Ligand binder design. Structure first.
Ligand code: CL
Ligand code: CL
Lengths: 150, 18
């Protein structure tokens, strides 16, 4: 339990630091900025277009086909930070739809597909466009939501 | 490709230095 206990402590402290605008580490800052960006993306998307999850239609036999058809079109002509947030939000919605349909078995698979796509097809762009540090500079401190509300 | 075009709606108009 030693390492699970350290993990629980770190998660809790990271959360409480984030609530006051602080961070446990650079990685925690990235995670937080991405959480906040996803929340805001999904808010904008559902007000304009529909709840994303409600639009998704998955079964274990075609789950990757569903994922790939969307992700390949999203990035067909290139990458930018807004599309990277969209990618995360889509994967989140696909996982929620899967569990809605009693198919939590698909969640691990989706996470793997996302990590692989990030590594193979997004990271090369990220590492030439300022890296995750730039993502935090641009989206951290709930920046996207703050701009809209302004 | 409904979903992806209208992710690219929000994502391009979420995209941020310029
Ligand atoms: Cl650090
Ligand atoms: Cl709402």
């Amino acid at each position: 339990m030693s390492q699970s206990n350290r993990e629980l402590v770190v998660d809790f402290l990271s959360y409480k630091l984030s609530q006051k605008g602080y961070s446990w580490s650079q990685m925690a800052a990235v995670k937080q900025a991405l959480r906040e960006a996803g929340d805001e993306f999904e808010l904008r998307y559902r007000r304009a277009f529909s709840d994303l999850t409600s639009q998704l239609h998955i079964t274990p036999g075609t789950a990757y086909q569903s994922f790939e058809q969307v992700v390949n079109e999203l990035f067909r002509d290139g990458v930018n930070w807004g599309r990277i947030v969209a990618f995360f939000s889509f994967g989140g919605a696909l996982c929620v739809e899967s569990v809605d349909k009693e198919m939590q078995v698909l969640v691990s698979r989706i996470a793997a597909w996302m990590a692989t796509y990030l590594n193979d097809h997004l990271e090369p762009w990220i590492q030439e466009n300022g890296g995750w540090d730039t993502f935090v500079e641009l989206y951290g401190n709930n920046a996207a939501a703050e701009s809209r509300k302004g | 490709i409904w979903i992806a075009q209208e992710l690219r709606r929000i994502g391009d108009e979420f995209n941020a230095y310029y």
